[PDB]
């Protein structure tokens, strides 16, 4: 199947309490493999997956210096964007960055991306063609003109459709024993009366990987939609994920409801009935 490598950056200013908090995390698919925390003691990029530990001393020196330089860049941008949006020095603000690349099962490049945010809202993003930018407002347009004149897109593209793909292929090979796995969800249903006349039917999906999954309820073929409680997909803590969906049904009519499970690790979508 397809795979992705993604890096996530968060810088949160804290005026009067020192330098901004900086946290960087790298992922291959849904598996974290590196991290950096400005408040941690090591002040180094640290391994978080077994297959990345074999990288040599130069790798960890290079990743530590480059991730520190990204934090210093966010430090300047936090004050610059503070002036763009006419905000005071007293408040805490956040810059978030995500970029990465996707490859196919044969390793071919599929797409690259980079998106930046300010205070949890879109700021600037690279377009699909990896040649132009889309600013979210007139303030971010100032950054766009600055990045256009500096030809930042051409530099970033050479990473996103080149260097990013090169490292993702190597990581997928080095961690083939754990990154090429697909665990199908274990499915079951539970029944919880809420009164003498109604009961909750909860449809469970446990121990699946990757996190992408679909749970839907259905009543006599007619889809249920807004009468369903759907919780966010959650990590089990061991590398797998969990999710459930519930619906309140009248007592005695449980046979009219069906749960439908969709996951790439399943040959055919499952249909459960109490």
């Amino acid at each position: 199947g397809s795979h992705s490598m993604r890096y996530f950056f968060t810088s949160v200013s804290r005026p009067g309490r020192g330098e901004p908090r900086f946290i960087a995390v790298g992922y291959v698919d849904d598996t974290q493999f590196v991290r950096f925390d400005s408040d941690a003691a090591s002040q180094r990029m640290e391994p978080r997956a077994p297959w990345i530990e074999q990288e040599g001393p130069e790798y960890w020196d290079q990743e530590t210096r480059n991730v520190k330089a990204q934090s210093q860049t966010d430090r300047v941008d936090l004050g610059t964007l503070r002036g763009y949006y006419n905000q005071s020095e007293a408040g805490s603000h956040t810059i978030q960055i995500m970029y990465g690349c996707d490859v196919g099962s044969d390793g071919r490049f599929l797409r690259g991306y980079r998106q930046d945010a300010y205070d949890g809202k879109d700021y600037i993003a690279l377009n699909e063609d990896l040649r132009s930018w889309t600013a979210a407002d007139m303030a971010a347009q100032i950054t766009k003109r600055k990045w256009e004149a500096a030809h930042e897109a051409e530099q970033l593209r050479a990473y996103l459709d080149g260097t990013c793909v090169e490292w993702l292929r190597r990581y997928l090979e080095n961690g083939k024993e754990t990154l090429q796995r697909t665990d199908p969800p274990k499915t079951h249903m539970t029944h919880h009366p809420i009164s003498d006349h109604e009961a909750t039917l909860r449809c469970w999906a446990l121990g699946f990987y990757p996190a992408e999954i679909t749970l839907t309820w259905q009543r006599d073929g007619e889809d249920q939609t807004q009468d369903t409680e759907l919780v966010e997909t959650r990590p089990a803590g061991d590398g797998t994920f969990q999710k459930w969906a519930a619906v309140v049904v009248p007592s005695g009519e449980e046979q009219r409801y069906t749960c439908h499970v969709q996951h790439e690790g399943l040959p055919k979508p499952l249909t459960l009935r109490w």
């Binding site: 890096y7 790298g26 990743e63 860049t73 300047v76 964007l81 530099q155």
Partner: peptide, 9 residues
Amino acid sequence: AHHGGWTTK
């Protein structure tokens, strides 16, 4: 490995 290129905003 992540990208080692930056331009301030």
